[PDB]
Amino acid sequence: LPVLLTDLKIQYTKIFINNEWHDSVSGKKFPVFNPATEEELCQVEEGDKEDVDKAVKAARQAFQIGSPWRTMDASERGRLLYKLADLIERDRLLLATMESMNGGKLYSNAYLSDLAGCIKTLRYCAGWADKIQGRTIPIDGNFFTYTRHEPIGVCGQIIPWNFPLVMLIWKIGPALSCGNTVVVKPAEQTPLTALHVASLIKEAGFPPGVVNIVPGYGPTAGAAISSHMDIDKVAFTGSTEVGKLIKEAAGKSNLKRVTLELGGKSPCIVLADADLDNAVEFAHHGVFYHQGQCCIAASRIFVEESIYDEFVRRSVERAKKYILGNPLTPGVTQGPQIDKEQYDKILDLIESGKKEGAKLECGGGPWGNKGYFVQPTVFSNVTDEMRIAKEEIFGPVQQIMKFKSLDDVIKRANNTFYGLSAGVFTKDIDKAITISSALQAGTVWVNCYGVVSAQCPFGGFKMSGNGRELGEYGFHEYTEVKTVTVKISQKNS
Amino acid sequence: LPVLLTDLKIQYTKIFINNEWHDSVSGKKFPVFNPATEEELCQVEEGDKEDVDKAVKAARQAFQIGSPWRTMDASERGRLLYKLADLIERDRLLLATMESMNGGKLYSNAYLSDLAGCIKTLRYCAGWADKIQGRTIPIDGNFFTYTRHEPIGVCGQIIPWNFPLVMLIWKIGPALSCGNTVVVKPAEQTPLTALHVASLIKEAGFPPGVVNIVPGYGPTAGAAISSHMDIDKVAFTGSTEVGKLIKEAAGKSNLKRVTLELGGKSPCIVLADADLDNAVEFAHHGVFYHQGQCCIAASRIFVEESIYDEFVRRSVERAKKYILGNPLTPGVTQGPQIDKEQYDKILDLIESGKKEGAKLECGGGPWGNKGYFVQPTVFSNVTDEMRIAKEEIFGPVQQIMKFKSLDDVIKRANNTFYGLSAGVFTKDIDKAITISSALQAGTVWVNCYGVVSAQCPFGGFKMSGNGRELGEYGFHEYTEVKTVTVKISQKNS
Amino acid sequence: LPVLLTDLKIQYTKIFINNEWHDSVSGKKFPVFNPATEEELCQVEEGDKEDVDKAVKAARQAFQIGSPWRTMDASERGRLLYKLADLIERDRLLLATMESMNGGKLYSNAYLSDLAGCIKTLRYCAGWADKIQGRTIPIDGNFFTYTRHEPIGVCGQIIPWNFPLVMLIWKIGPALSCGNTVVVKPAEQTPLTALHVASLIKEAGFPPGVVNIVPGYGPTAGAAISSHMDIDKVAFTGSTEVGKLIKEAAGKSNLKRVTLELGGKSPCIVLADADLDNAVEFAHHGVFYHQGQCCIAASRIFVEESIYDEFVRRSVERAKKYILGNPLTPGVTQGPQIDKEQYDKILDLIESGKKEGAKLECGGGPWGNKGYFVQPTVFSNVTDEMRIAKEEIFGPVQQIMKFKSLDDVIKRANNTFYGLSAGVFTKDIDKAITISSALQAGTVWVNCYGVVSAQCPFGGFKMSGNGRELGEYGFHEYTEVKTVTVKISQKNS
Amino acid sequence: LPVLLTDLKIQYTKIFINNEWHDSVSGKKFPVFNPATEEELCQVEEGDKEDVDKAVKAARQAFQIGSPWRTMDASERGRLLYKLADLIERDRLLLATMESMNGGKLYSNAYLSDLAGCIKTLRYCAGWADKIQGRTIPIDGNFFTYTRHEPIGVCGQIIPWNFPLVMLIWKIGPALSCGNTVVVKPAEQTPLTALHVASLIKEAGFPPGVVNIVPGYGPTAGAAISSHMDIDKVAFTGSTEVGKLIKEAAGKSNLKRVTLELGGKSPCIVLADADLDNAVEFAHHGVFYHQGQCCIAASRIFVEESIYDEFVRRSVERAKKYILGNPLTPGVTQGPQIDKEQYDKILDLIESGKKEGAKLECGGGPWGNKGYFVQPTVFSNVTDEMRIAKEEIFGPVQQIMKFKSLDDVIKRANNTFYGLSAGVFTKDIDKAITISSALQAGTVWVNCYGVVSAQCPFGGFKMSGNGRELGEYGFHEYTEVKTVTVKISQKNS
């Protein structure tokens, strides 16, 4: 793992529309800060309805019949995606640093893990461009029918900071692969990662106006991209709240297609037969990976009575072993949160549990002064009524209940309004298959966790989301399906 | 074609929940009327939040793990669907009559066409139950992944009267096939068709509480089924208005999955090389089939200059040849509309065009006294600014513009906020393929129209709809996709 | 289970070509016998090159463009298949009896199991007729491509007696579904089952000359159907020997497509953690189901040392519990073999093991006088060098080795030239997935056996077979794939 | 187009097994010659049963469980393929030259066309490695089934010279993608192209013993690779003769899977409405591309009476316009044939037609002295009885019949024992679809020809071939399908 000791510089801070770095009409530029240190990083600009509208207009152009981007052979879309990927891999070092300096994330995590993931989505999605096929339904009659999988149109993507670049990639890969044009709105907590990738797309040679990024504060662009009368798909990844907002506006605009992957409270279910060693390590990443800021974080470990206490032991034991240090520092297994917003919130949640008599086995507070560091916390004896068990503590905090039966645990996990993921640790074949099905989640993990690959479709059940991403199924959201039926004369089977 | 001279009787007028004919809590029962005669047919009941909630509760029961309906082998779901189909075909005669007496529709159309269609969806969907398969993604790592296509849960279906039974079937086929449980809310203009089919499902042996129908006025159940905190999918087929309503509530409830197939203004594009004979006949069904009450009605025929007038001639010529008579009378090619609502509206639209200087080549008014009969109308010299060219005249009325180029016509059709369907009549290979793609519709028809088969996916682009129906793609809306990843030891390709 | 005490009558004994019961040119009619009693059942006829050629000619007619069978909408092919299925289910009783009286098979097995299976293939395959679709490859260039899945042509099917009707159905379902025409050659040991089904197809209304059956001795028709210069696919299910014969002639005729599902020696691998109870019962059906005359019979159980002896105990224990009685007698769990051929052979194999020092724990000989009954036998301490462990003892005989490691057992099973199936009994998740993959078989069974459903593709690896059957993959053998590429003008994505 | 004036050097002339350049056991090395000049190019070695057996042994090693090549994540197989592709593109210039110097082919054709094609297969096939998925059949019962698409094993590929590198790529792409190991036997007329690519695979980092090339004379290795008792798939691309040979040995060895794409006589069908301009140009490439040495060459143009003569005119007109010059010379549109073998044969065929009274409108003989150059020939007034119309004149020679009806022409084309391809030139929609279906070919071309892309499956009907290549369907030949069924407890839909 190379280290970019080079003081990371922010090369891009402006809006990218028509492959050109515009500015803000109001001339208003918001400020980005290093949450690991609280210092300011730079002054990216802030978009508004004008810029969204501006870019959306760019999109329709890119998407028009006989455009450069529509007549381009699909294989060539794939060829271009592969280049962005290859370009991102070349600049990996820096791009990895710009995520840490702005997302506050262990570098080993934003290099050995994140940027690699981003490249691999674009690589996968590239090889899926020329393989999205139609059908030739053997209809009845002397007619000949065939479905065509065709691009939707302009796609608006609202991303969340947690994974500044991975989700951008998870959304401009399936999109650009199927042939759609994207207006990307990156988050406020972190605008740098994307703006930079936009420059690499331009080097890749993507046509002018295919991928338009409109960095800028939420409320504003949101309603816009999500109510333009020219955008057809709004894909939002963020918290449930903003989500009902985006979907509402969707109806109240054009019935545009809406795929939203909100979050959830996911349950781990270690069982008497589990290899506690394994369950302990993986239950650990589950809650303390990226400082619990992954929508798939195990904010609810249920351990069977038999092995409740033991689990508790190592669980907290390893918890304290995390290091609230510098994401830009080696050996650091935990970084800042992200901002006073989540930061204060996290602490508040920690407090609530305390009030609720949570078994605060560790942490409970913050570490250090400048920046935003919370102390790897743990709450034993959590009950299904504790707030810590009813909400997304999106942050480092571990809650751990106790169950005595299989039916009870699967019921006590499915008693939520969420279903992004789950972990059943077991050493039994029958349990594995029953608890994997009885659980209501989009992705269940048996004896592992956080294992998400591009190939595998990912999304959420219930109010955890809408649609899927990655996979072969994530290219179903960005392609409409035109049936054409011709009147041939005699139709022979 | 047999004729049910037998005075059609309304056997069912009450709510079907848990395979039992309940009543209305308020004891309020709405009245259904024969639009062909305006006489009342019977007194079906009217549901409310209580009954919706009642039935939704029935559903969750039906859908529970180890339920009778979930442990049932998929093949058996198919076996049961095939029986409903076979039962519907046995009772065809009557069931055909109950649609005419309540939908006001030519019997030849509700027998030789509609009921046949209804059976064939259920037959198709039945043979799709045991063939919805997952995958075994060759993921990276020594892990083994597989996607499972699993039932969503309780599905709420809001149907429109136009096709009282076909859409019920288009929605309880893909659903019941994939294993979901349905709470069906039929329309007010016509509750009889469905309630009856519900009885046939019970004879078919469908478990108790799988298919619950809650007949009842719109506003009420609507918000309910569409905001229950236990229904997961709301599929609505109706007008755009109610649609943004259902989707907005969706977000403002559970982010439940929402597939809505609203309507559209569809364009026919007869061209200089077309076989006017063919184009004339098919452009005729396009607008005057089921009294223009098909969301795919050609409310916009564009004829190239060369053959504008000629087309106009036969077009109107055949128009007058339609017969505003008795849907329950043989030889009648047109029946009542449906109710003063659409009836008055239709006439109003007719008037507006008159005010707009539409070339009222025929009709313009109503025919007969009792019931709701409009005179097959036609409006030549329509312009893209005439109201008749900007709205769904959902009723018998034909509008006919004139275009001089291919680019112009395809632009003047794609200049709408709709895209359910279209008809390009041509005798040229290149046109066919370009105009079929350049057009923005879910279903384009070349040299034919109204040709919709179950096998072929159907839905709408733009604000014409959301998702698809029928097809192999219509079983993509009712199945969620669970990825399970196991940690095997060594993984060999 | 109803019982057809009615003295089963053989209604059909002649050749079915053009939906008509022809005879034999030579006038030669072979004799069929009841192996349960050795009495003769009737005198079916014997075909020859003339009759094969005769029927093949019928086929080409049925398959010609604009034929009745080619212009028939696929849905209608499915509709017709469903009727044969429904007809077979109506006559189930008798048809079940005609298999027992001729195959010598426990009635409970030829009713509660076999005929049910036959119906379910035809039901499945029926619902697969209208869903075999092409694609619309997004090729490069301004061209438009689409693959059409089209019928091969006349298909020749050589069946084996063991499952007289199930394999006929496994071959005239995928075929008739995809639209091909079949010339079926049934076995000598048992011609009745099929000839009868042919009559039911005719009642079903299948066109005249679609399904032509040419009953008749092997050698003769074989080379014919398999070297006609008008048949395109020869699907043979039988022993390896005849198979290399059919394939060699294939090349030496027309390179016709050849899918052959020969047999194999399949290995069960019970392990220390297995539920011996379960493993014992299922390992039992594995070898003594249908008198070991199933190509998937466990002629090789490997038990780990730990639980070797115990397994041996119950294994033989239950073995003796089988009853060499009357297949047409209730309570009989084992019937005759099939004919002196296999009968003598079986006994010979039994003897060879004895010579090899097999641990003859039970049986070893025949039971009763008339007919062909062998005594449920068992051979402990079998070694990988014993003939009983190198050949298909296609008959009741159980061999049981002992293994001490996982690697060793999976190696000692994969050391064959076969791979139809296998059974890994385990209670461990990791073993299950590794031994299921490490094993070289088309169908591996974990903790069960003989579980074969229509939906699941079935065939053999290595010299155990060629291609697959059932499944969605079994409609890949009977459909060729025509790519058509048109030169459209501008091609927009 | 860069030109490798650099005297092309033959870097590789030896056998590649275990990523090492072995030699020949007999020490026998065959000689390769430049057919454009008849001079010798170098002295490649000649393999035998020993070397085949040698390499096959290497393969099994590469394919073993836990091998480096089997545990490799599929994505990584794709990553490696992409590198070979990228490496081939880097060396393009030379590799293009080594095909011309040895295949005798216009450089513009072996650069701007061939090497590009080779790279694009490997690029496509690479992106298909991680997307070959199984299924999760919703079987009946409380069982859980899933099909696994798994590598077959060692694959033996016999290539033909015509496209020395493209077919190597068409066979080591689908193979290496699905995970199989290949023993490639290149042709005698041309061994250089492949041996070189083998070096690039090694640079790509493909494991040691995955791709083993055994250059060497036909008869020898043939029977070997095709009868090794360790190779499972033999894919041969060549003439029909050798094909029945390879398939017969297949049965007479292991029933190994056999996909053979032999050749054919393909028919063009220009029609009265065709754009003769277009039909003329494309009918030209059809027969004179790569000197008629493409298995898809239009050795049978049928022109409707109306426009027979006209077609004849330009057809021959452009024919003479071809240039029998130097494939390594710019502006040369035709090169040598390949060797006295085809060369003498070609001339013989030309003579036969002369004897048959063919309307020798042009050519008829050879051009120049050294090398192997035939004069672009044409034969008008060909009849369906002329030898030139019953055999593959695999070489430059054009035959042109006359037809008066559609039915007649489609019958006169389908009256062959072949079906690789066809060209229907038309300007009518109905013809296009009927003649495209009525024709019996794997690939029909409407208004174009020779248009073959990787994405599109390609193979032959009838005795023109077996199986398909490219496409998503070409990864169905190299993957077997293991069904695993587990006994879960309760199975909920």
XYZ file of N, CA and C in Angstrom, chain D residues 285-360:
228
model
N -18.250 -9.181 -51.647
C -17.468 -9.623 -50.522
C -17.842 -11.051 -50.224
N -19.121 -11.371 -50.338
C -19.589 -12.713 -50.052
C -18.763 -13.805 -50.681
N -18.343 -13.629 -51.923
C -17.611 -14.700 -52.591
C -16.115 -14.441 -52.656
N -15.702 -13.188 -52.766
C -14.278 -12.904 -52.936
C -13.584 -12.349 -51.704
N -14.161 -12.551 -50.529
C -13.488 -12.110 -49.327
C -12.552 -13.200 -48.874
N -11.306 -12.854 -48.575
C -10.330 -13.850 -48.174
C -10.305 -14.938 -49.200
N -10.433 -14.571 -50.463
C -10.345 -15.543 -51.525
C -11.283 -16.687 -51.261
N -12.557 -16.400 -51.072
C -13.557 -17.445 -50.910
C -13.237 -18.507 -49.896
N -12.273 -18.232 -49.045
C -11.857 -19.216 -48.088
C -12.538 -18.973 -46.766
N -13.750 -18.425 -46.796
C -14.526 -18.232 -45.575
C -15.676 -19.190 -45.657
N -15.938 -19.951 -44.604
C -16.977 -20.978 -44.697
C -18.333 -20.376 -45.006
N -18.433 -19.061 -44.951
C -19.690 -18.389 -45.190
C -19.714 -17.701 -46.521
N -18.939 -18.202 -47.471
C -18.844 -17.549 -48.763
C -20.028 -17.840 -49.643
N -20.521 -16.822 -50.324
C -21.706 -16.976 -51.146
C -21.442 -17.744 -52.395
N -21.232 -19.033 -52.263
C -21.084 -19.822 -53.441
C -22.422 -20.168 -53.992
N -23.286 -19.188 -54.229
C -24.569 -19.434 -54.870
C -25.403 -18.212 -54.779
N -25.307 -17.338 -55.766
C -26.144 -16.171 -55.784
C -27.331 -16.482 -56.662
N -28.544 -16.289 -56.161
C -29.743 -16.502 -56.949
C -30.353 -15.154 -57.208
N -30.440 -14.749 -58.470
C -31.020 -13.456 -58.818
C -32.319 -13.608 -59.548
N -33.315 -12.823 -59.183
C -34.629 -12.996 -59.775
C -34.536 -12.669 -61.232
N -35.421 -13.234 -62.029
C -35.319 -13.042 -63.451
C -35.270 -11.588 -63.787
N -36.226 -10.843 -63.291
C -36.287 -9.457 -63.640
C -34.912 -8.869 -63.695
N -34.146 -9.012 -62.627
C -32.850 -8.351 -62.587
C -31.695 -9.309 -62.666
N -31.883 -10.423 -63.348
C -30.769 -11.338 -63.513
C -29.620 -10.716 -64.275
N -29.847 -10.355 -65.517
C -28.739 -9.876 -66.314
C -28.028 -8.718 -65.680
N -28.774 -7.752 -65.181
C -28.109 -6.570 -64.674
C -27.161 -7.004 -63.606
N -27.653 -7.861 -62.728
C -26.825 -8.272 -61.640
C -25.587 -8.864 -62.267
N -25.763 -9.758 -63.229
C -24.617 -10.426 -63.811
C -23.592 -9.407 -64.200
N -24.039 -8.354 -64.861
C -23.114 -7.341 -65.329
C -22.181 -6.864 -64.243
N -22.708 -6.098 -63.303
C -21.848 -5.523 -62.291
C -21.129 -6.603 -61.530
N -21.798 -7.728 -61.295
C -21.200 -8.784 -60.492
C -19.845 -9.155 -61.028
N -19.799 -9.512 -62.301
C -18.534 -9.847 -62.917
C -17.707 -8.600 -63.025
N -18.357 -7.491 -63.328
C -17.616 -6.262 -63.526
C -16.716 -6.028 -62.344
N -17.293 -6.067 -61.155
C -16.503 -5.795 -59.973
C -15.540 -6.941 -59.754
N -15.904 -8.122 -60.237
C -15.060 -9.288 -60.044
C -13.691 -9.045 -60.623
N -13.652 -8.648 -61.880
C -12.387 -8.426 -62.530
C -11.628 -7.339 -61.802
N -12.350 -6.467 -61.111
C -11.707 -5.347 -60.433
C -10.876 -5.786 -59.233
N -11.005 -7.042 -58.824
C -10.162 -7.533 -57.741
C -8.738 -7.670 -58.263
N -7.755 -7.668 -57.374
C -6.376 -7.690 -57.809
C -5.594 -8.861 -57.265
N -5.198 -9.777 -58.133
C -4.373 -10.877 -57.703
C -3.010 -10.300 -57.574
N -2.665 -9.848 -56.382
C -1.385 -9.200 -56.196
C -0.650 -9.750 -55.010
N -0.097 -8.870 -54.188
C 0.589 -9.320 -52.984
C -0.166 -8.959 -51.716
N -0.604 -9.977 -50.956
C -1.257 -9.684 -49.690
C -0.417 -8.753 -48.839
N 0.906 -8.787 -49.007
C 1.778 -7.892 -48.255
C 2.022 -6.655 -49.072
N 1.142 -6.398 -50.033
C 1.263 -5.202 -50.855
C 0.015 -4.374 -50.748
N 0.185 -3.053 -50.586
C -1.004 -2.229 -50.415
C -1.772 -2.180 -51.700
N -3.061 -1.920 -51.606
C -3.893 -1.815 -52.787
C -4.277 -3.161 -53.343
N -3.791 -4.223 -52.715
C -4.082 -5.552 -53.210
C -5.336 -6.067 -52.560
N -6.320 -6.381 -53.378
C -7.582 -6.824 -52.859
C -7.716 -8.321 -52.900
N -6.685 -9.017 -53.356
C -6.733 -10.462 -53.347
C -5.349 -11.003 -53.284
N -5.161 -12.076 -52.541
C -3.849 -12.648 -52.397
C -3.776 -14.039 -52.937
N -2.763 -14.787 -52.508
C -2.651 -16.160 -52.960
C -3.779 -16.957 -52.405
N -3.909 -18.218 -52.786
C -4.912 -19.041 -52.145
C -4.258 -19.426 -50.847
N -3.840 -20.670 -50.707
C -3.111 -21.017 -49.500
C -2.048 -22.059 -49.768
N -2.354 -23.004 -50.636
C -1.388 -24.024 -50.945
C -1.827 -24.819 -52.147
N -0.884 -25.500 -52.776
C -1.200 -26.270 -53.958
C -2.455 -27.066 -53.714
N -2.647 -27.511 -52.481
C -3.807 -28.330 -52.173
C -5.082 -27.633 -52.610
N -5.432 -26.555 -51.921
C -6.634 -25.814 -52.277
C -6.412 -25.192 -53.626
N -5.178 -24.786 -53.894
C -4.884 -24.114 -55.151
C -5.209 -24.982 -56.356
N -4.692 -26.195 -56.364
C -4.958 -27.085 -57.464
C -6.428 -27.377 -57.480
N -6.980 -27.599 -56.301
C -8.382 -27.941 -56.226
C -9.197 -26.835 -56.835
N -8.899 -25.605 -56.455
C -9.705 -24.514 -56.929
C -9.735 -24.595 -58.413
N -8.564 -24.724 -59.018
C -8.495 -24.715 -60.470
C -9.302 -25.857 -61.034
N -9.237 -27.004 -60.375
C -9.995 -28.157 -60.833
C -11.483 -27.850 -60.851
N -11.977 -27.256 -59.777
C -13.384 -26.919 -59.718
C -13.690 -25.987 -60.859
N -12.790 -25.043 -61.119
C -13.063 -24.075 -62.152
C -13.247 -24.845 -63.435
N -12.383 -25.825 -63.660
C -12.447 -26.621 -64.878
C -13.724 -27.402 -64.987
N -14.151 -27.981 -63.881
C -15.337 -28.810 -63.922
C -16.510 -28.011 -64.446
N -16.670 -26.793 -63.947
C -17.780 -25.962 -64.375
C -17.668 -25.741 -65.862
N -16.450 -25.496 -66.328
C -16.247 -25.260 -67.740
C -16.792 -26.442 -68.492
N -16.439 -27.636 -68.038
C -16.925 -28.842 -68.682
C -18.434 -28.877 -68.618
N -18.988 -28.371 -67.527
C -20.431 -28.407 -67.350
C -21.139 -27.318 -68.137
N -20.382 -26.542 -68.899
C -20.984 -25.494 -69.695
C -21.310 -24.281 -68.862
N -20.630 -24.131 -67.730
C -20.832 -22.953 -66.901
C -20.650 -21.735 -67.771
N -21.388 -20.666 -67.501
C -21.156 -19.451 -68.259
C -19.937 -18.737 -67.688
N -18.745 -19.176 -68.072
C -17.536 -18.578 -67.563
C -17.450 -17.153 -68.033
